[PDB]
Design a protein around this ligand. Sequence first.
Ligand SMILES: *[C@@H]1O[C@H](CO)[C@@H](O[C@@H]2O[C@H](CO)[C@@H](O)[C@H](O)[C@H]2NC(C)=O)[C@H](O)[C@H]1NC(C)=O
Ligand SMILES: *[C@@H]1O[C@H](CO)[C@@H](O[C@@H]2O[C@H](CO)[C@@H](O)[C@H](O)[C@H]2NC(C)=O)[C@H](O)[C@H]1NC(C)=O
Lengths: 44, 93, 98
Amino acid sequence: FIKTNNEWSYTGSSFYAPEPITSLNTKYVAPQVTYQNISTNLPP
Amino acid sequence: IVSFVVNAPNGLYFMHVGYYPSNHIEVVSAYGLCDAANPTNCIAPVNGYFIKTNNEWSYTGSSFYAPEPITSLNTKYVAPQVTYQNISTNLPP
Amino acid sequence: QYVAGYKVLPPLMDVNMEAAYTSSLLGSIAGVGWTAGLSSFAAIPFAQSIFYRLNGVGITQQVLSENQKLIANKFNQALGAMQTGFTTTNEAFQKVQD
Ligand SMILES: *[C@@H]1O[C@H](CO)[C@@H](O[C@@H]2O[C@H](CO)[C@@H](O)[C@H](O)[C@H]2NC(C)=O)[C@H](O)[C@H]1NC(C)=O
Ligand SMILES: *[C@@H]1O[C@H](CO)[C@@H](O[C@@H]2O[C@H](CO)[C@@H](O)[C@H](O)[C@H]2NC(C)=O)[C@H](O)[C@H]1NC(C)=O
């Protein structure tokens, strides 16, 4: 869950290449306290 | 698959029951089925292969030839690739 | 070998048997590793094989889908680097000599 200077995006684990997040690269997990909050630009 | 352990007069003696395939045949499969109208919506088989067969595609496993139509229960959504085989005439659900 | 007198047995199989084993394993290395379980066979062309193998270790599909040529050239020079590498600096060559 990279931050961008180009507002998050996706990057893998072995190459630096930001790209927009989708449902194809994440999973729905129960919330924890340390997770960041956002209410400005909702991810798809 | 499974194993069993028994004693031996100076050691340990092992049974191992495993899968042994036979009567292997050759078929024609693809790498990913994706709609032509919607290029984003592409799926890929899970622990198996998308199969073209005769009495259109179906699903097969990975250790036995058991043809079966694909569902969401044995596939996952994967990003489009140019090498994935397209389909436009009979879309699975 | 006979001045003192001792036999040197040839190995258990002729060189063509090792050639057949290595050729079979090189022809199957592209195809065995695509799905867990060794019952099926998946003799893919080697390009899609290395694409999926490099994708599975934490690389997004986009960069490999757009940069086949550079990684192919890197693979070619990486394989060609060891052709002249057979010298004292190779640990495995030193172990062979030992
Ligand atoms: C995002 O907001 C939620 C809602 O307040 C925060 O979650 C709770 O934070 C309090 C404050 O310490 C905890 O006592 C609760 O246990 C948290 N609940 C859950 C379900 O996490 C969350 O910490 C905030 N995230 C930030 C600020 O990064
Ligand atoms: C399935 O259709 C898609 C879209 O029409 C094809 O994807 C494009 O194919 C052209 C020509 O091969 C390429 O120039 C584009 O770069 C492809 N797009 C992407 C996003 O990769 C795809 O080739 C078709 N597949 C089959 C098997 O017919």
